[PDB]
Structure formats: structure tokens, C-alpha cells
Copies of this chain bind each other. A is one copy, B any other.
Amino acid sequence: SAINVMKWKTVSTIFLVVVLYLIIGATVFKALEQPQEISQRTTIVIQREKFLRAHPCVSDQELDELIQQIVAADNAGIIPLGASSNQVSHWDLGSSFFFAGTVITTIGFGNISPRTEGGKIFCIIYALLGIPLFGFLLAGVGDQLGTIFGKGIAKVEDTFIKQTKIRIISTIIFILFGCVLFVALPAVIFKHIEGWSALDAIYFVVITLTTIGFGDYVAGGSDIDFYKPVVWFWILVGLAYFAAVLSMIGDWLRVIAKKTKEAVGEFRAHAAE
């Protein structure tokens, strides 16, 4: 029980650190997003009134009700228009493959989701069984890429031999060339093909490879066949790379935390001599 007390102490401290991290993030996010939210809400009410007064026809609750039915279609995509009344399949051959990949990688873009009860129960079991299997594949791809690196890093460190300070150089080259291969090039290719901006491109890259997946940006969701498989294969390899990067960042965080712990101890003991 001696170590359990210290363990609970550490866990509580981490908990509070994360809570305050969330508080800071929430403040920054609301202070960065609520202004445009209010602008959009006021302009949307403006256009609502403009269309209501121009067509005071019977609607009102029918109008909000129509936007509500529009909302249900919206999630699956409201695509009802006089031109192009023929639609495309969000569940065609490759789309369901795309969806299964999102499910197993726990990305879950959500741009397309199952509506059938059977579809939902399936997706449940399919995830419960695929997440670990895909974990195995990911760990393997990780190992493979790590050895592919170790080879080239043993090649690159021999030339720089003109121990304790060489690992810094190797990690620098690792992060550099990785951000090149798994962040820069795919982001530029997306900017081109998908028509995104540089920001949007790198932001989609990061949100995908971190397994967050918001859904705002998807490489295979717009109606704009060698691109999609390469994108998914990237997603896999980039996921391995980002696992490595996040592990390094966590190591750095632990180092900084245990450094500031002794810093605070120092400050407490001295109190200005």
C-alpha cells in the first residue's frame, strides 16, 4: 500500500493538470470561435427574415420544420435539387470499404454513418473485432518502418562521426524527413486534388493521423480511382509515424514535468535565500 498512496497522488495531480489544460483550451477556443458564430447567427436570421417577408406564404413553423427535415437529410447530405435529381451512392462498392477503414482505425470521420439497425449492430461487432486486428497490423507496419529507419540512421550517423549527443541529431532528422513524407507531400497533393488551402490540408492531415477525424475535411467524401487507395495506404503509414511522434511528445512532456517538479522544489526551499 506504500506505493499505492504515491500512485493515487500522481494520478490526482495529472487529473487536475488535464482539467486546467481543458479549461485553457476551452477559453481559447470560445474566444476564437464565438465571434464568427454570432456574426453567422445574425446574418442567418437576416436572410431568414428576408426570405420570410418576401414569401409570407404559409410556412413559419413549416419553414423551421422544413429546415429540420433538411437537417436529417443534411447528415447524410440533403441533395434534393431540380438539377441532378439523380444521386450518387454513399454506400457503393468502395464507399463501404472506406467506411470500414475509418471504423477499424477509430478515425470515424462520420461523413457517412449506418442508418440500419442491422448496420449499426454490425458496425459495433466489426469495430470490437477489427480495432485490435488493425492494431496488430499497425504495430507491424511500425516495426517495419522503424527498422527501415534504423538502417538509414546507422548510415547517416557514421558520416557525422568526426554518443550521448548523437541521438538528438538522429531524432531531428527523423522528425524532419517524417513531416516531409507524411505531412508535407500528402498535404500538398490534397491541396491540389481536393482544392483545399495549405492550412486546411495540413489540418486535415493532422486530424486524420491523430485518429481524431472531425469530418469537416475528408479526402474521399466529395464528388470531385488510384487516389483513394493511396490515400488509405498513406493513412496507415502516417498513423504509424504519428504514433511514434506522439510517443516522443509524451516523453518530452514527462521530462518537462519532472524537471519543473524539481524546479518548484528548488524555489520552495530557497525563497530568496
Q: Which of under 10, 10 to 19, 20 to 34, or 35 or more describes the interface residues of A?
A: 35 or more
Q: Please name all residues of chain B whose beta carbon is closer than 8 Å to the beta carbon of A78 when the two chains form the complex.
A: 44, 67, 70-71, 74
How many of these chains are in the complex? 2
A45: Cβ under 8 A from any B Cβ: yes
Is residue A114 within 8 Å, beta carbon to beta carbon, of the partner chain? yes
List, in ascending order, chain B residues with CB within 8 A of A97's CB.
Answer: 22-23, 25-26
Among A58-66, A157-165, A166-174, A264-272, the stretch in contact with B: A58-66
Cβ of A193 within 8 Å of any chain B Cβ, yes or no, is: no
CA distance A36 to B117 in the complex (A): 11
**Interface of A: prevailing SS:** helix
Closest B residue to A141 using CB positions: B11
Tell me, yes or no, whether A190 is within 8 Å of chain B by CB.
Answer: no
Q: Is A136 an interface residue (CB 8 A)?
A: yes
Q: Which of B32, B62, B129 contacts A119 (CB 8 A)?
A: B32
B67 and A100 contact, CB distance less than 8 A: no
Q: Given known contacts A34-B91, A119-B33, is B45 in contact with A80 (CB within 8 Å)?
A: yes
- A202 interface residue per 8 A CB criterion: yes
